[PDB]
Short mmCIF file of N, CA and C and ligand atoms in Angstrom, two decimals:
data_model
loop_
_atom_site.label_atom_id
_atom_site.label_comp_id
_atom_site.label_asym_id
_atom_site.label_seq_id
_atom_site.Cartn_x
_atom_site.Cartn_y
_atom_site.Cartn_z
N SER A 384 -26.50 24.49 100.55
CA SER A 384 -26.71 23.63 101.59
C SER A 384 -28.62 23.14 101.47
N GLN A 385 -29.07 22.75 102.58
CA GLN A 385 -30.59 22.26 101.75
C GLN A 385 -31.84 23.17 101.76
N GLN A 386 -31.47 24.84 102.33
CA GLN A 386 -32.10 26.35 102.16
C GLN A 386 -31.67 26.06 100.15
N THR A 387 -30.62 26.16 99.10
CA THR A 387 -30.34 26.44 98.91
C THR A 387 -31.16 25.72 97.22
N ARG A 388 -31.44 24.38 97.69
CA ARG A 388 -31.91 23.04 97.60
C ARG A 388 -34.01 24.28 97.33
N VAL A 389 -33.76 23.85 98.66
CA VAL A 389 -35.41 24.67 98.50
C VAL A 389 -35.27 25.80 97.95
N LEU A 390 -34.50 27.06 97.91
CA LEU A 390 -35.08 28.49 97.13
C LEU A 390 -34.75 27.91 95.40
N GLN A 391 -34.30 27.29 95.43
CA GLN A 391 -33.57 26.80 94.20
C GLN A 391 -35.38 26.08 93.41
N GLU A 392 -35.93 24.95 94.53
CA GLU A 392 -38.00 24.28 94.06
C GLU A 392 -38.62 26.14 93.75
N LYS A 393 -38.28 26.47 94.86
CA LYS A 393 -39.28 27.88 95.27
C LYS A 393 -39.75 28.85 93.68
N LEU A 394 -38.48 28.97 93.51
CA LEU A 394 -37.74 29.95 92.07
C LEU A 394 -38.43 29.80 91.10
N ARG A 395 -38.51 27.94 90.26
CA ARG A 395 -38.43 26.66 89.66
C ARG A 395 -40.52 26.70 90.18
N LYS A 396 -41.26 27.05 91.25
CA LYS A 396 -42.10 27.02 90.23
C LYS A 396 -42.74 28.37 90.12
N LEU A 397 -42.02 29.01 90.75
CA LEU A 397 -42.80 30.75 90.34
C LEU A 397 -42.76 30.98 88.72
N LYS A 398 -41.51 30.61 88.20
CA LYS A 398 -40.77 30.46 86.79
C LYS A 398 -41.67 29.76 86.05
N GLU A 399 -42.48 28.71 86.64
CA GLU A 399 -43.45 27.11 85.76
C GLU A 399 -44.76 28.21 85.84
N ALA A 400 -45.19 28.79 86.22
CA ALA A 400 -46.74 29.33 86.48
C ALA A 400 -46.47 30.43 85.75
N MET A 401 -45.78 31.25 85.15
CA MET A 401 -45.71 32.41 84.10
C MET A 401 -45.89 31.30 83.15
N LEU A 402 -45.36 29.75 82.96
CA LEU A 402 -45.62 29.24 81.23
C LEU A 402 -47.42 28.84 80.91
N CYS A 403 -47.03 29.31 79.92
CA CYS A 403 -48.51 28.56 79.50
C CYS A 403 -49.19 27.10 79.12
N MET A 404 -50.00 26.70 79.77
CA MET A 404 -50.14 26.04 80.61
C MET A 404 -50.84 24.38 80.00
N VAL A 405 -50.56 25.08 78.78
CA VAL A 405 -51.53 24.21 77.51
C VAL A 405 -49.88 23.91 76.88
N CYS A 406 -48.97 24.32 76.45
CA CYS A 406 -48.41 24.10 75.63
C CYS A 406 -47.41 23.90 76.78
N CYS A 407 -47.28 24.74 78.18
CA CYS A 407 -45.49 25.04 78.77
C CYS A 407 -44.91 25.23 78.90
N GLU A 408 -44.04 25.85 77.05
CA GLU A 408 -43.04 25.95 77.10
C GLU A 408 -42.76 27.37 76.66
N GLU A 409 -43.91 28.63 76.43
CA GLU A 409 -43.91 29.29 75.98
C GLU A 409 -44.51 30.94 77.43
N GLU A 410 -43.76 32.16 77.91
CA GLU A 410 -44.19 33.02 78.43
C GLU A 410 -45.76 33.49 78.31
N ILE A 411 -47.00 32.83 79.56
CA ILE A 411 -47.80 33.92 78.97
C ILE A 411 -47.72 35.08 78.63
N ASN A 412 -49.17 35.52 78.01
CA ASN A 412 -48.84 36.77 77.78
C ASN A 412 -50.15 37.15 76.85
N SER A 413 -51.07 36.08 77.18
CA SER A 413 -52.63 37.06 76.64
C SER A 413 -53.73 36.33 77.76
N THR A 414 -54.58 37.01 77.77
CA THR A 414 -56.07 37.07 78.84
C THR A 414 -57.34 36.79 78.50
N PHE A 415 -58.23 35.71 78.81
CA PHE A 415 -59.06 35.42 77.04
C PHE A 415 -60.15 36.41 78.18
N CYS A 416 -60.81 37.20 76.98
CA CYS A 416 -61.77 37.79 77.85
C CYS A 416 -63.45 37.30 77.33
N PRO A 417 -64.30 37.40 78.26
CA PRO A 417 -63.82 38.62 79.35
C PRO A 417 -63.67 37.90 80.16
N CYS A 418 -63.62 36.19 80.59
CA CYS A 418 -63.92 36.33 81.82
C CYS A 418 -62.16 36.41 82.48
N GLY A 419 -60.56 37.29 81.31
CA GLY A 419 -60.56 36.97 82.58
C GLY A 419 -58.96 36.68 83.06
N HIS A 420 -59.36 35.15 82.43
CA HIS A 420 -58.20 33.72 82.94
C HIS A 420 -56.69 34.34 81.58
N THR A 421 -55.41 34.34 82.96
CA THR A 421 -54.40 34.86 82.00
C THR A 421 -53.03 33.52 82.44
N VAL A 422 -53.59 32.09 81.47
CA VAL A 422 -53.45 31.57 81.48
C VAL A 422 -52.72 30.89 79.59
N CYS A 423 -52.67 31.30 79.00
CA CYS A 423 -51.99 30.95 77.31
C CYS A 423 -50.21 32.09 76.97
N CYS A 424 -49.95 31.58 75.96
CA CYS A 424 -49.55 32.03 75.67
C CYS A 424 -50.08 32.59 74.82
N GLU A 425 -49.43 33.36 73.45
CA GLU A 425 -49.98 33.95 72.13
C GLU A 425 -50.90 32.63 71.51
N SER A 426 -50.05 31.67 70.98
CA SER A 426 -50.09 30.62 70.21
C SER A 426 -51.44 30.15 70.68
N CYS A 427 -51.60 29.22 71.65
CA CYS A 427 -52.33 28.13 72.32
C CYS A 427 -53.28 28.95 72.65
N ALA A 428 -53.51 30.74 72.91
CA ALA A 428 -54.80 31.08 73.47
C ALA A 428 -55.68 30.96 71.97
N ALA A 429 -54.64 31.60 70.54
CA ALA A 429 -55.84 31.65 69.27
C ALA A 429 -56.28 30.60 69.13
N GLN A 430 -55.93 29.57 69.71
CA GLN A 430 -56.39 28.00 69.18
C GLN A 430 -58.14 27.66 70.11
N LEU A 431 -57.74 28.32 70.72
CA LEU A 431 -58.87 28.31 71.76
C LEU A 431 -59.76 28.82 71.47
N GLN A 432 -61.74 28.16 71.81
CA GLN A 432 -63.09 28.90 71.10
C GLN A 432 -63.48 28.98 72.70
N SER A 433 -63.01 28.21 73.88
CA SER A 433 -63.12 27.95 74.97
C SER A 433 -62.03 28.70 76.23
N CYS A 434 -62.64 28.70 76.99
CA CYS A 434 -61.17 29.07 78.16
C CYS A 434 -61.02 27.76 79.09
N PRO A 435 -59.50 27.25 78.72
CA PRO A 435 -59.47 26.17 79.61
C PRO A 435 -59.37 26.19 81.05
N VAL A 436 -60.24 27.35 81.36
CA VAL A 436 -59.88 27.07 82.69
C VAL A 436 -61.31 26.89 83.47
N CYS A 437 -62.05 27.97 83.01
CA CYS A 437 -63.92 28.30 83.02
C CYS A 437 -64.63 27.76 82.75
N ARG A 438 -63.92 27.09 81.14
CA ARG A 438 -64.70 26.82 80.02
C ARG A 438 -66.18 28.06 79.16
N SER A 439 -65.83 29.14 79.87
CA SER A 439 -66.72 30.79 79.12
C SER A 439 -66.25 30.21 77.86
N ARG A 440 -66.67 30.68 76.59
CA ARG A 440 -66.77 31.00 75.70
C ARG A 440 -66.02 32.75 75.19
N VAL A 441 -64.38 32.59 74.85
CA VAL A 441 -63.69 33.40 74.59
C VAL A 441 -64.48 33.96 73.12
N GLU A 442 -64.51 35.52 73.51
CA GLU A 442 -65.22 36.26 72.79
C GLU A 442 -63.62 37.49 72.02
N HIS A 443 -63.02 37.86 72.67
CA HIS A 443 -61.97 38.16 71.76
C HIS A 443 -60.59 37.67 73.17
N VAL A 444 -59.75 37.52 72.54
CA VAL A 444 -57.84 37.90 73.35
C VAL A 444 -57.19 39.12 73.22
N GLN A 445 -56.40 39.68 74.78
CA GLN A 445 -56.50 40.67 74.95
C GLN A 445 -54.80 40.81 75.07
N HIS A 446 -53.87 40.96 74.72
CA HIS A 446 -52.18 40.70 75.13
C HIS A 446 -52.21 41.61 75.86
N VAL A 447 -51.16 40.92 77.08
CA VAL A 447 -50.85 42.10 77.87
C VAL A 447 -49.20 41.66 78.35
N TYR A 448 -48.60 43.30 78.05
CA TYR A 448 -47.87 43.10 78.50
C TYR A 448 -47.61 43.23 80.33
N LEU A 449 -46.48 42.20 80.61
CA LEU A 449 -45.94 42.28 81.88
C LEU A 449 -45.45 42.32 82.30
N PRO A 450 -44.92 43.10 83.16
CA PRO A 450 -42.86 43.21 83.62
C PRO A 450 -42.40 42.66 84.27
N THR A 451 -42.77 41.81 84.84
CA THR A 451 -42.05 40.52 85.21
C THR A 451 -41.58 39.56 83.29
N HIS A 452 -42.30 39.54 82.21
CA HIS A 452 -42.16 39.36 80.26
C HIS A 452 -40.48 39.58 80.86
N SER B 916 -25.09 29.26 101.97
CA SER B 916 -24.40 29.69 101.03
C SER B 916 -24.76 31.82 100.57
N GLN B 917 -23.19 31.50 99.62
CA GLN B 917 -23.32 32.72 98.48
C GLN B 917 -24.61 33.03 98.02
N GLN B 918 -24.54 31.05 97.26
CA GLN B 918 -25.00 30.30 96.72
C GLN B 918 -26.71 31.07 96.49
N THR B 919 -26.78 30.96 97.96
CA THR B 919 -28.50 30.70 98.68
C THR B 919 -28.50 32.58 98.62
N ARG B 920 -27.55 33.06 98.77
CA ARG B 920 -28.29 34.69 98.29
C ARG B 920 -28.17 34.83 97.70
N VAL B 921 -28.06 34.58 96.65
CA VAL B 921 -27.95 35.53 95.08
C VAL B 921 -29.53 34.64 95.02
N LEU B 922 -30.76 33.06 95.03
CA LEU B 922 -31.34 32.24 94.92
C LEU B 922 -32.23 33.13 95.17
N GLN B 923 -32.22 34.03 96.90
CA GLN B 923 -32.89 34.85 97.66
C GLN B 923 -33.28 35.92 96.78
N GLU B 924 -32.38 36.89 96.37
CA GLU B 924 -32.46 38.02 95.42
C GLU B 924 -32.98 37.86 94.35
N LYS B 925 -33.25 36.89 93.87
CA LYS B 925 -33.14 36.58 92.08
C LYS B 925 -34.93 36.56 92.90
N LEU B 926 -35.45 35.77 93.88
CA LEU B 926 -36.89 35.51 94.20
C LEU B 926 -37.72 36.84 94.33
N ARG B 927 -36.81 38.11 95.39
CA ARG B 927 -37.15 38.58 95.82
C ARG B 927 -37.08 39.59 94.45
N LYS B 928 -36.72 39.85 93.49
CA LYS B 928 -37.30 40.95 92.28
C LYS B 928 -37.73 39.71 91.44
N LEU B 929 -38.40 38.63 91.33
CA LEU B 929 -39.38 38.39 91.30
C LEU B 929 -40.55 38.57 91.37
N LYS B 930 -40.24 38.88 92.72
CA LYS B 930 -41.15 39.19 93.85
C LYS B 930 -42.65 40.34 93.67
N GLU B 931 -41.22 41.11 93.56
CA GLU B 931 -41.30 42.97 93.86
C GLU B 931 -42.41 43.38 91.92
N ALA B 932 -41.68 42.97 90.70
CA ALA B 932 -41.94 42.50 90.26
C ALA B 932 -43.75 42.70 89.93
N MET B 933 -43.96 41.57 90.18
CA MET B 933 -45.57 41.12 90.42
C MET B 933 -46.69 42.38 90.96
N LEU B 934 -45.64 43.57 91.83
CA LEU B 934 -46.53 44.74 92.26
C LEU B 934 -46.77 45.80 91.66
N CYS B 935 -47.96 46.39 92.12
CA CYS B 935 -48.66 47.46 91.08
C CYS B 935 -47.28 48.24 91.37
N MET B 936 -46.82 49.29 90.19
CA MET B 936 -46.40 50.12 89.80
C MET B 936 -46.67 51.27 90.82
N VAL B 937 -47.67 51.88 91.32
CA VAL B 937 -48.21 52.97 91.57
C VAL B 937 -47.88 53.16 93.43
N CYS B 938 -49.15 52.15 93.66
CA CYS B 938 -48.63 51.83 95.38
C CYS B 938 -47.69 50.74 95.96
N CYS B 939 -47.37 49.76 94.94
CA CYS B 939 -45.94 49.10 95.41
C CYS B 939 -46.55 48.72 96.60
N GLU B 940 -47.80 47.98 96.92
CA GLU B 940 -48.57 47.14 98.19
C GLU B 940 -49.46 46.67 97.31
N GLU B 941 -49.79 46.41 96.39
CA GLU B 941 -50.48 45.18 96.22
C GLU B 941 -50.20 44.88 94.56
N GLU B 942 -50.14 43.73 94.68
CA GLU B 942 -50.74 42.90 93.77
C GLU B 942 -50.80 42.80 92.30
N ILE B 943 -50.53 42.95 90.60
CA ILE B 943 -51.02 43.14 89.11
C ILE B 943 -52.11 42.58 89.28
N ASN B 944 -53.14 43.05 88.93
CA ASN B 944 -54.68 42.57 88.82
C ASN B 944 -55.64 43.07 87.24
N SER B 945 -54.68 43.69 87.16
CA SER B 945 -55.90 45.25 85.86
C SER B 945 -55.04 45.20 84.61
N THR B 946 -55.44 45.22 83.59
CA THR B 946 -54.83 45.48 82.52
C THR B 946 -55.22 46.86 81.62
N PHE B 947 -54.89 47.72 81.50
CA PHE B 947 -55.68 48.28 80.24
C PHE B 947 -55.95 48.19 79.27
N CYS B 948 -56.90 48.15 78.62
CA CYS B 948 -57.40 47.90 77.51
C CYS B 948 -57.82 49.33 76.95
N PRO B 949 -57.40 49.41 75.56
CA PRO B 949 -56.59 48.16 74.01
C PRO B 949 -55.25 48.29 74.78
N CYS B 950 -54.32 48.81 74.61
CA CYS B 950 -53.14 48.79 75.01
C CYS B 950 -52.43 47.59 75.50
N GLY B 951 -53.44 46.86 76.56
CA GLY B 951 -52.10 45.71 77.18
C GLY B 951 -51.52 45.28 78.26
N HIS B 952 -51.24 47.18 78.59
CA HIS B 952 -50.40 47.18 79.57
C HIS B 952 -51.26 46.40 80.87
N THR B 953 -50.41 45.83 82.16
CA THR B 953 -51.19 45.29 82.86
C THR B 953 -50.32 45.17 84.23
N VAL B 954 -49.82 46.83 84.44
CA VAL B 954 -48.66 47.13 85.93
C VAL B 954 -49.92 47.35 87.01
N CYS B 955 -51.02 47.34 87.03
CA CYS B 955 -51.55 47.98 88.38
C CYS B 955 -51.96 46.95 88.95
N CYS B 956 -53.05 47.54 90.71
CA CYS B 956 -54.15 47.08 91.12
C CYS B 956 -55.18 47.27 90.73
N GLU B 957 -56.28 46.77 91.21
CA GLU B 957 -57.64 46.83 90.04
C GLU B 957 -58.01 48.87 90.58
N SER B 958 -57.42 49.20 92.85
CA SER B 958 -57.88 50.85 92.54
C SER B 958 -56.79 51.14 92.09
N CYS B 959 -55.86 50.71 92.21
CA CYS B 959 -54.73 52.42 91.50
C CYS B 959 -54.97 52.59 89.94
N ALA B 960 -55.38 51.26 89.10
CA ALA B 960 -56.48 51.84 87.63
C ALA B 960 -57.12 52.31 87.55
N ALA B 961 -58.24 52.29 88.29
CA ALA B 961 -59.73 52.57 88.43
C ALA B 961 -59.41 54.17 87.99
N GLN B 962 -58.92 54.77 88.30
CA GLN B 962 -59.61 56.40 87.82
C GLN B 962 -58.09 56.84 86.71
N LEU B 963 -56.81 56.41 86.25
CA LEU B 963 -56.15 56.62 85.87
C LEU B 963 -56.81 56.68 84.80
N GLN B 964 -56.87 57.43 83.10
CA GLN B 964 -57.69 58.45 82.07
C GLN B 964 -56.70 57.54 80.98
N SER B 965 -54.77 57.65 81.45
CA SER B 965 -54.44 57.40 80.44
C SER B 965 -53.62 55.89 80.42
N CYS B 966 -53.28 55.17 80.09
CA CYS B 966 -52.01 54.96 80.58
C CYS B 966 -50.45 55.63 80.88
N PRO B 967 -50.17 54.91 82.49
CA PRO B 967 -48.98 55.39 82.68
C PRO B 967 -47.58 55.41 81.78
N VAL B 968 -47.46 53.67 80.98
CA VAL B 968 -46.96 53.44 80.94
C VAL B 968 -46.64 53.54 78.63
N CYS B 969 -47.34 54.04 78.53
CA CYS B 969 -47.67 54.36 77.58
C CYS B 969 -48.50 55.24 77.04
N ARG B 970 -48.89 55.92 77.51
CA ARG B 970 -50.00 57.30 77.28
C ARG B 970 -51.03 57.29 76.89
N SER B 971 -51.13 55.57 76.12
CA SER B 971 -53.06 55.90 75.48
C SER B 971 -53.98 55.83 76.10
N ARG B 972 -54.98 56.07 75.59
CA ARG B 972 -56.30 56.26 76.01
C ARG B 972 -56.53 55.07 76.86
N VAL B 973 -57.43 54.97 78.05
CA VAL B 973 -57.79 53.99 78.96
C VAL B 973 -59.38 53.58 78.16
N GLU B 974 -59.28 52.82 76.87
CA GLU B 974 -60.82 52.62 76.76
C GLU B 974 -61.72 51.81 78.39
N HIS B 975 -60.81 50.97 78.70
CA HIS B 975 -61.37 50.18 80.73
C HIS B 975 -60.56 49.64 80.31
N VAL B 976 -60.88 48.89 81.67
CA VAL B 976 -59.89 48.43 82.62
C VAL B 976 -59.85 46.32 82.46
N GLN B 977 -59.61 45.42 82.19
CA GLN B 977 -59.84 43.63 81.64
C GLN B 977 -59.21 43.18 83.09
N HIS B 978 -59.99 42.86 84.23
CA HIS B 978 -59.84 42.39 85.19
C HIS B 978 -58.32 40.51 84.68
N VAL B 979 -57.67 40.41 85.66
CA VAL B 979 -57.09 39.55 85.29
C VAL B 979 -56.19 38.46 86.48
N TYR B 980 -56.67 37.72 86.20
CA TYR B 980 -56.64 36.30 87.02
C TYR B 980 -55.69 34.97 86.29
N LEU B 981 -54.49 35.79 87.47
CA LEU B 981 -52.39 35.23 87.20
C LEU B 981 -52.78 34.01 87.67
N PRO B 982 -51.66 32.56 87.41
CA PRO B 982 -51.85 31.34 88.11
C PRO B 982 -50.81 32.32 89.43
N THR B 983 -49.56 32.73 89.64
CA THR B 983 -49.43 33.72 90.20
C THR B 983 -49.66 34.13 92.05
N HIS B 984 -50.71 34.52 91.56
CA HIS B 984 -51.39 35.21 92.07
C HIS B 984 -51.56 34.60 93.25
N1 LIG C 1934 -65.46 50.73 82.34
C1 LIG C 1934 -64.39 49.88 83.07
O1 LIG C 1934 -63.17 49.92 83.14
C2 LIG C 1934 -65.37 48.64 84.14
C3 LIG C 1934 -66.13 48.35 83.03
C4 LIG C 1934 -65.00 46.84 82.22
C5 LIG C 1934 -65.44 46.22 81.45
C6 LIG C 1934 -66.75 46.41 81.59
F1 LIG C 1934 -67.51 45.66 79.90
C7 LIG C 1934 -67.95 46.90 81.79
C8 LIG C 1934 -67.10 48.08 82.56
C9 LIG C 1934 -65.43 49.24 85.07
C10 LIG C 1934 -65.40 48.82 86.61
C11 LIG C 1934 -64.18 48.69 86.96
N2 LIG C 1934 -63.20 48.12 86.42
C12 LIG C 1934 -64.03 47.77 84.97
ZN1 ZN C 1935 -48.13 27.81 75.08
ZN1 ZN C 1936 -61.92 32.13 81.96
ZN1 ZN C 1937 -51.66 50.23 93.12
ZN1 ZN C 1938 -50.07 51.39 77.65
#
């Protein structure tokens, strides 16, 4: 039905929100500290000296184990 | 259709996986450091001395800003 299409779009958007904002390919699993923005995979987070959301300096990267993983 | 019901179930399960494992009411937004388990809301994470998943000592809690928030 049309509701099947609506639900498919909601699921796609929720799944896309869990993917890295830089490479768009791998799941988010890393936090920039101390700002707390958790928007990258471990490979993109390792290559950024500044947070891509707020531009704060990245002091270090914390790996996150999320139940959605 | 039956496909609409299957998609509704997938959406519901993904949304439930984003909720605090202790209170089941608030969104997960806190990480236990250094282990990295990100399973609680700020209130529930505040008084735990050890991780409820792996038993590692919690040295501090890092707030996380997730795109799914
Ligand atoms: N000890 C902690 O877990 C907090 C904290 C963490 C790191 C830090 F540099 C200062 C304070 C304190 C307040 C609430 N939870 C966060
Ligand atoms: Zn990436
Ligand atoms: Zn940031
Ligand atoms: Zn809670
Ligand atoms: Zn843990």
